[PDB]
C-alpha cells in the first residue's frame, strides 16, 4: 500500500523554472532519503538530488546551481524546483524512495512516483481534434473488425485514450504519438472486435489530454 | 563521479532463451549494484540489488552475478529463460558514491513470422469541416517490425505526405502494429477517388493493398 504519487505542469517555456510536487502514502517520510530521477532520450536516467525529513538535502554537482528541494511532512510531501530550464531539461521525471537510514549503502530505487512528462517549448498549449476510424467492409477480416479513434493536433504530451471508461481493453492498440510537420503530436488508438458485434456494441473512444484539460468522448459507428 | 557502461545497447531472443546483459564500473563499487526493468511509459522496477539480491515479487528467473569482491565493477543480469512480458528495457545502477545508471539495454523478443492484418480507414465527415484529410492504414499484430507501406491515390504514388508509428512489441505475444496516415487538403481529397495503401512485408507471399472509394457506400 506505499505508493508514490507525482503533479505539477508539464509544459514550460525556457528560462521558467520547474515545479514539481510528490506525495507519499502508507507510511510517513522518516527513515529514507527521497531523489528525483530524470529520463531524458539523449542523456537517459539522471539522478538529480535527495532530501530527507528533516530538510537535508544532497544536489547532484551538475545540479547545484539550479535546483532546490523542500519537504511538508504534515503533508507527507516533498518537491522539486529546477530554475533556468532549457530545452535539455524536458524528459520524465519521478520521485523515488531511497537509502534508508538503517543502512549506510542502500541507495536503489525500491518505490516510484508515476513520472511526470515535462516539455520545455515555445508552443503553446492545444488539444486535440478526434475523429472515428470507422469500422467499414474494407476494415474486416475472417469475422475481425477494425475501428479506432484519430487524436490529432494537440500540444504538449502526453493524451491518455482508454475505451468505453476502461471496460474494453483487450485488442486495443495505442500509438506512441509523432510529431506533425505542423508542430502537433498526433496519434491513433484501434481496436479489434468481432464483426458480429458492430451490430449492437457501442463503441466510445474516451480521450484525456491534461495538459489543456480537454476531453472527448467520441462514439465509433460505421458510417 | 563513477561512471556505469552497459552492453549490448539491444539484444534479440527468443521465448525459453537464457539472456545475459553486462555493466562495468570506471571504478570499483564492491556489491552495491542495482538492475531495474523498465517498460515504456511506465517507471522503472527494481529487480535486483546489492548485485545478486531479488527484489520482491521478482521471478526467480531473473539473477544478479559478479566476482563477490569488494574490487568489483563488472555485473551481469541474467534471465535463465525469457518469457513474453520480459521484453522491456534493463537498466543497470551503482551506489557506491552519487547514484548514476547506465544506458540501458533494449531486450526484444524473436518469434514466428505473421503477416499483418491491413485495414484502411477514410476521413471522416467532421475532420473534413476543417479542411484537410487523414487517411489511415493499420497493419495489425504482425513480426518482424520491418514493413514498408506505400500509398496511391487514383494510382498515382505519394511521397511526403505520410508519416508512421510502430507500437511496442506486445508483451503478450510479441506483436507490432504500425498506423501509416496520410495527411490531404480537404480539395484534394475530394478532387480524388481511389485511396490505397499497399504493404509489404515477410510473411506476404505479395504485397497487400487495401483502398476504399471516396462516397461508396
Known amino acids: 500500500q506505499v505508493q508514490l504519487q507525482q503533479w505539477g505542469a508539464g509544459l514550460l517555456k525556457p528560462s521558467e523554472t520547474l515545479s514539481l510536487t510528490c506525495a507519499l502514502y502508507?507510511?510517513?517520510?522518516?527513515?529514507?532519503?527521497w531523489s528525483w530521477i530524470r529520463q531524458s532520450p539523449g542523456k537517459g536516467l539522471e539522478w538529480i538530488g535527495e532530501?530527507?525529513?528533516?530538510?537535508?538535502?544532497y544536489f547532484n554537482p551538475s545540479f547545484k546551481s539550479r535546483v532546490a528541494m523542500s519537504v511538508d511532512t504534515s503533508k507527507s510531501q516533498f518537491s522539486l524546483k529546477l530554475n533556468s530550464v532549457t530545452a535539455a531539461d524536458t524528459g520524465i521525471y519521478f520521485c523515488?524512495?531511497?537509502?534508508?537510514?538503517?543502512?549506510?549503502?542502500?541507495?536503489?530505487?525500491?518505490?516510484w512516483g508515476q513520472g511526470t512528462q515535462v516539455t520545455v517549448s515555445s508552443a503553446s498549449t492545444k488539444g486535440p481534434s478526434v475523429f472515428p476510424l470507422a469500422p467499414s467492409s474494407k476494415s474486416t477480416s475472417g469475422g475481425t473488425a477494425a475501428l479506432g479513434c484519430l487524436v490529432k493536433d494537440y500540444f504538449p504530451e502526453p493524451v491518455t485514450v482508454s475505451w468505453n471508461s476502461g471496460a474494453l481493453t483487450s485488442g486495443v492498440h495505442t500509438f506512441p504519438a509523432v510529431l506533425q510537420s505542423s508542430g502537433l503530436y498526433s496519434l491513433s488508438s484501434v481496436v479489434t472486435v468481432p464483426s458480429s458485434s458492430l451490430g449492437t456494441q457501442t463503441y466510445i473512444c474516451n480521450v484525456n489530454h491534461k495538459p489543456s484539460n480537454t476531453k472527448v468522448d467520441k462514439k465509433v459507428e460505421p458510417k | 563521479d563513477i561512471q556505469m557502461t552497459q552492453s549490448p545497447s539491444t539484444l534479440s531472443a527468443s521465448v525459453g532463451d537464457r539472456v545475459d546483459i553486462t555493466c562495468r564500473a570506471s571504478?570499483?563499487?564492491?556489491?552495491?549494484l542495482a538492475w531495474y526493468q523498465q517498460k515504456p511509459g511506465k517507471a522503472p522496477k527494481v529487480l535486483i540489488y546489492?548485485?545478486?539480491?531479488?527484489?520482491?515479487g521478482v521471478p526467480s528467473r531473473f539473477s544478479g552475478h559478479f566476482n563477490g569482491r569488494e574490487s568489483a565493477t563488472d555485473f551481469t543480469l541474467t534471465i535463465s529463460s525469457l518469457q513474453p512480458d520480459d521484453v522491456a528495457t534493463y537498466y543497470c545502477?551503482?551506489?557506491?558514491?552519487?547514484?548514476?545508471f547506465g544506458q540501458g539495454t533494449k531486450l526484444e523478443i524473436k518469434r514466428t513470422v505473421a503477416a499483418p492484418s491491413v485495414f484502411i480507414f477514410p476521413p471522416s465527415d467532421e475532420q473534413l469541416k476543417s479542411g484537410t484529410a487523414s487517411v489511415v492504414c493499420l497493419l495489425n499484430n504482425f513480426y518482424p517490425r520491418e514493413a514498408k507501406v506505400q500509398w496511391k491515390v487514383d494510382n498515382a504514388l505519394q511521397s511526403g505526405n505520410s508519416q508512421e508509428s510502430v507500437t511496442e512489441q506486445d508483451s503478450k505475444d510479441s506483436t507490432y502494429s504500425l498506423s501509416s496516415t496520410l495527411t490531404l487538403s480537404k480539395a484534394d481529397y475530394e478532387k480524388h477517388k481511389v485511396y490505397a495503401c499497399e504493404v509489404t512485408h515477410q510473411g506476404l507471399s505479395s504485397p497487400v493493398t487495401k483502398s476504399f472509394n471516396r462516397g461508396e457506400c
Open positions: 523515488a524512495r531511497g537509502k534508508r537510514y538503517s543502512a549506510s549503502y542502500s541507495n536503489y530505487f525500491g518505490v
Open positions: 502508507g507510511r510517513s517520510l522518516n527513515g529514507n532519503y
Open positions: 545502477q551503482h551506489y557506491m558514491a552519487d547514484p548514476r
Open positions: 532530501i530527507n525529513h528533516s530538510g537535508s538535502t
Open positions: 546489492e548485485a545478486s539480491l531479488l527484489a520482491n
Open positions: 571504478q570499483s563499487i564492491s556489491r552495491w
